[PDB]
Amino acid sequence: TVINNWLLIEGHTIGIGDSIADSKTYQDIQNTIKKAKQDVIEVIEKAHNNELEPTPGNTLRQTFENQVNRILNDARDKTGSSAQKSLSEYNNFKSMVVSGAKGSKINISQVIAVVGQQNVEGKRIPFGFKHRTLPHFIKDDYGP
Amino acid sequence: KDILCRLEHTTLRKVTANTAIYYDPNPQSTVVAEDQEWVNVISPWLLRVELDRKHMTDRKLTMEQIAEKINAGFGDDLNCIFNDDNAEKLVLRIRIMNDDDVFLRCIESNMLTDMTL
């Protein structure tokens, strides 16, 4: 009762302005995503030129998938941290997260920085077509 | 890793590179032309298996253990010989000590599937 009737004075909202970041944070997110895509391209090139030595305990496919997932997870974590550092005290996503009432830091990172990797049964999106995820890609495309 | 190899199940399915049956009625002149004086040291049919270095050295196995396991599992009916540890060609030859072709096929299936090194 006391907290609701004080909230009548203080108020609590959420809107578009809580979902945006400044231009510097957007440049950091885009730089991290570009760096990650370049790293995945380099790992693809290394596996394609047979310069990728497999890790012990798994074949070339599993070590390539592990390297790609490591790069994409590192990108997701870095972009999430960069989005979290841009939040002000007045941010309402942060207000609901750090009160524990609703949401998480992952939700803020997905709204602001990057949604991330979509998974089906613990792996990336499978080649439902003939060596393609969709007909808009080339065959044997293992990129992000 | 030594205990891991002592625990993990290993047959010839996971250690040989390719197996082949030939016809060698005269062991003094073998059809593969690979050290017939070693072949000097009874059925005309032989079972010739070939191993690979990587799977042999992963389990740290040697041909003496495999040959003794073959002899223990099959009695005196099978004669196994082995050489070329330093010649980069991992070969064991198995003959029959006294229609035989189906028997070699059956014992080859048994060696590759149903006996444990």
Binding site: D39, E42, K46, P56, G57, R70, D74 | -
Partner: protein, 143 residues
């Protein structure tokens, strides 16, 4: 910086080769090289596979072997002695260090190097598994 070796695909990182060239060109930077190498060797990388951690330790130990071959001998063997008994490092790493050292060194040897390298080769967890016979024969006949 954490999550660096996790993002390295090659067997040996290029910066470790930069350390190798630093040790090759100059000898005054050898304590700094060894300090960085023991900092990385003592670091636990929980984000890597256990075999990936083991081969990373082997790579750092290869850099240590190069540092030993470039004249900075006694502190490296002292660190391996420290790692053997009063530290819980992998005995396979110590055996790999002994194998790498004994494949590049030839007689004669000094008294200090023999006195510092003999106890790690007679620790009952190294000598039995692990040429080394020529080295122990030379150490027995000379020292």
């Amino acid at each position: 910086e954490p999550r660096y070796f996790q993002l390295q695909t090659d067997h040996t990182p290029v910066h470790l080769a930069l350390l190798d060239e630093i040790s090759t060109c100059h000898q005054l930077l050898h304590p700094q090289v060894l300090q960085l190498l023991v900092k990385l060797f003592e670091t636990e990388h929980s984000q890597l596979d256990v075999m990936e951690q083991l081969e990373l330790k082997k790579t750092l130990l290869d850099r240590m072997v190069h540092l030993l071959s470039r004249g900075y001998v006694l502190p490296v063997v002292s660190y391996i002695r420290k790692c053997l008994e009063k530290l819980d490092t992998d005995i396979s790493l110590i055996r790999y260090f002994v194998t790498e050292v004994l494949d590049v060194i030839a007689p004669p040897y000094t008294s200090d190097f023999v006195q510092l390298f003999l106890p790690i080769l007679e620790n009952d967890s190294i000598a039995g598994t692990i040429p080394v016979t020529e080295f122990i024969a030379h150490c027995k006949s000379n020292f």
